[PDB]
Amino acid sequence: AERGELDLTGAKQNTGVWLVKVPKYLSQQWAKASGRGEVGKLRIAKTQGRTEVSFTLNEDLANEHPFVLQSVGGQTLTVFTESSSDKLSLEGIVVQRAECRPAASENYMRLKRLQIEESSKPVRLSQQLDKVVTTNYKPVANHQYNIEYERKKKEDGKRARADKQHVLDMLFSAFEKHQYYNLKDLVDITKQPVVYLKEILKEIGVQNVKGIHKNTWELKPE
Amino acid sequence: IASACLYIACRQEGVPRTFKEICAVSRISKKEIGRCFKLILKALETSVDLITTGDFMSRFCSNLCLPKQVQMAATHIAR
DNA sequence: CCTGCCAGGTAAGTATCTCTGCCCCGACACAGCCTCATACGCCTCACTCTTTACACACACGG
DNA sequence: CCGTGTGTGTAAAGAGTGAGGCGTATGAGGCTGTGTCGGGGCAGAGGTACTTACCTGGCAGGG
Questions:
Q1: What burial class does residue B4 get, using C-beta atoms within 10 Å of its C-beta: 0-12 exposed, 13-18 middle, 19+ buried?
Q2: CA A155 – C1' D42 distance (Å)?
Q3: Which residues have CB under 8 Å from A58's CB, separation 6+?
Q4: How many CB atoms lie within 10 A of CB A138?
Q5: Gap from A132 CA to chain B (nearest CA, Å)
Q6: Fewest beta carbons less than 10 Å away: which of A92, A159, A184, B29?
Q7: What ranges does the record give for the region Core promoter DNA-binding, renumbered to this chain (chain B)?
Q8: What is the CATH classification number for the domain harbouring A206?
Q9: Rounded to the nearest 5°, which phi and psi values hold at A48?
Q10: Which structural domain, as residue segments, surrounds residue A165?
Q11: What CA–CA distance (Å, rounded) separates A132 from B65?
């Protein structure tokens, strides 16, 4: 008894099931009914030396499907289910294989022609324009992306030069979080002018050359 | 500078484009094109003939899809 | 306990880039005049389907 | 034969969006100036066929 264990009671019961392939219209009709409780009746006729299997579509559903059996000796097919409760189980072993084919010979192709047309409906293709488009690159005094960036820069304003003591106190607090800091990233934390930050950082901070990437600043005075 | 030079070239060739039309095809704004345009004229010691209403009728009317008769009427009315 | 020439296979050789600091800048305020251009905003107007009210009418049925 | 139970007109609210003009605000332009700061180049480390030649494996002797 485990989550990964597979139940084999169905196999031990020698349960037999049939594997049948059906066309789209038959399945589509069943999907359309949404499982009202019945979609048709399967009729099996066995003669002295032959067997006949066919399916009859429901009259209500419409508003013959002869079945051809196939040999199963070529493969061993078994059905396993994955319950929503995470309890895998083996439904059984397939004992017969069949295929469903339509009864109509030529008039069926008319349905396929519509089906192919339906399948090709969303196939987009180029369109021809009578007139050359004149709505592109319309004259404008300033681009919308540019006024927004200009407004944001104006609203934010230029970074101010704060007193040395406050910058130093904030500068060292940053060093606590990370041993090494990049000048470009350090500027954001301090929110101070690059020249002013470098001047204060130069007095105490030092540059350490790293061959892996580049030379960066050291916030340690020594 | 390239946007302003493009504006000046159109004027020199007799087919002026508006500063807005040049700005539409350029990331640079109209104000910056106009400023570079003045400096380029000073630097080159050159000038551009004043634009007239008839310098834009063919492009504006053709883009609006107006007939030749309407374009001629608009050209006469403005002049 | 080493040492080497030849056949076969292979192989040439020719012919027909990503950051990175860094000095030398634009654009901010803001002053009056001034003309025309561009943007916003706000209330008044329109209208349109969908009820909302209200006097009146009209079977309806046994 | 007079009760009552349902219909109907038609502008009147009731929202439900939608539209349009106007008036105020904004801008752009040189100008001139002054602190400043992001900025933007700026170069810079730093990471198709035939023939001939050459090399390798093998078996052979030699010492």
A1: buried
A2: 30
A3: A38, A39, A40, A41
A4: 10
A5: 9
A6: A184
A7: 31-35
A8: 1.10.10.10
A9: -65, -30
A10: 156-218
A11: 10
